[PDB]
Curated annotation (Swiss-Prot), chain A:
It comes from the Eukaryota. Single-stranded DNA-dependent ATP-dependent helicase that plays a key role in DNA non-homologous end joining (NHEJ) by recruiting DNA-PK to DNA. Required for double-strand break repair and V(D)J recombination. Also has a role in chromosome translocation. The DNA helicase II complex binds preferentially to fork-like ends of double-stranded DNA in a cell cycle-dependent manner. It works in the 3'-5' direction. During NHEJ, the XRCC5-XRRC6 dimer performs the recognition step: it recognizes and binds to the broken ends of the DNA and protects them from further resection. Signal peptide: none annotated. This is X-ray repair cross-complementing protein 5. It comes from Homo sapiens. The chain holds residues 652 to 732 of 732 of the full protein.
Curated annotation (Swiss-Prot), chain B:
It comes from the Eukaryota. Serine/threonine-protein kinase that acts as a molecular sensor for DNA damage. Involved in DNA non-homologous end joining (NHEJ) required for double-strand break (DSB) repair and V(D)J recombination. Must be bound to DNA to express its catalytic properties. Promotes processing of hairpin DNA structures in V(D)J recombination by activation of the hairpin endonuclease artemis (DCLRE1C). Recruited by XRCC5 and XRCC6 to DNA ends and is required to (1) protect and align broken ends of DNA, thereby preventing their degradation, (2) and sequester the DSB for repair by NHEJ. It is found in: Nucleus; Nucleus, Nucleolus; Cytoplasm, Cytosol. Disulfide bonds: none annotated. DNA-PK is a heterotrimer of PRKDC and the Ku dimer (composed of XRCC6/Ku70 and XRCC5/Ku86). Formation of this complex may be promoted by interaction with ILF3. Component of the core long-range non-homologous end joining (NHEJ) complex (also named DNA-PK complex) composed of PRKDC, LIG4, XRCC4, XRCC6/Ku70, XRCC5/Ku86 and NHEJ1/XLF. Additional component of the NHEJ complex includes PAXX. Following autophosphorylation, PRKDC dissociates from DNA. Interacts with DNA-PKcs-interacting protein (KIP) with the region upstream the kinase domain. Belongs to the PI3/PI4-kinase family. This is DNA-dependent protein kinase catalytic subunit. Signal peptide: none annotated. It comes from Homo sapiens. It is linked to Immunodeficiency 26 with or without neurologic abnormalities: A form of severe combined immunodeficiency characterized by reduced or absent T and B cells, recurrent candidiasis, and lower respiratory tract infections. Some patients show dysmorphic features, severe growth failure, microcephaly, seizures, and impaired neurological functions.
Length: 80, 37
């Protein structure tokens, strides 16, 4: 049980750091059934609630795009 | 080219990360008559 619980944590974070079009959103909306630990209750349910909603959104950071010599170009396109 | 780049940096990239009288009338009349300013 707990082994697949930490496996669930690992796979969830792995798909999170992965960026896909048909990403874990389909998995999560079907992962409404036990995507999180259940060996001792209490922590199990709250961890399930935390993992269900994947937790927030805010963009920040300069020169973080593909081919940084275009990141300044991306910065260049900010004046018109 | 670098001077022109400095100029264009002067406004854009203002932040960090710069991508590395009767007497006077009489005198004038005398000057005009003399033709010397």
């Amino acid at each position: 049980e707990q082994r697949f619980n930490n496996f669930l944590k690992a796979l969830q974070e792995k798909v999170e750091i992965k960026q896909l079009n048909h990403f874990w959103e389909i998995v999560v909306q079907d992962g409404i059934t036990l995507i999180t630990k259940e060996e001792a209750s209490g922590s199990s349910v709250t961890a399930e609630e935390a993992k269900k909603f994947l937790a927030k959104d805010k963009p920040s950071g300069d020169t973080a795009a593909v081919f940084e010599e275009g990141g300044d170009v991306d910065d260049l396109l900010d004046m018109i | 080219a670098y001077n022109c780049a400095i100029s264009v940096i002067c406004c854009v990239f203002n932040e960090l990360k710069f991508y590395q009288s009767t007497l006077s009338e009489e005198m004038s009349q005398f000057d005009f008559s003399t033709g010397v300013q």
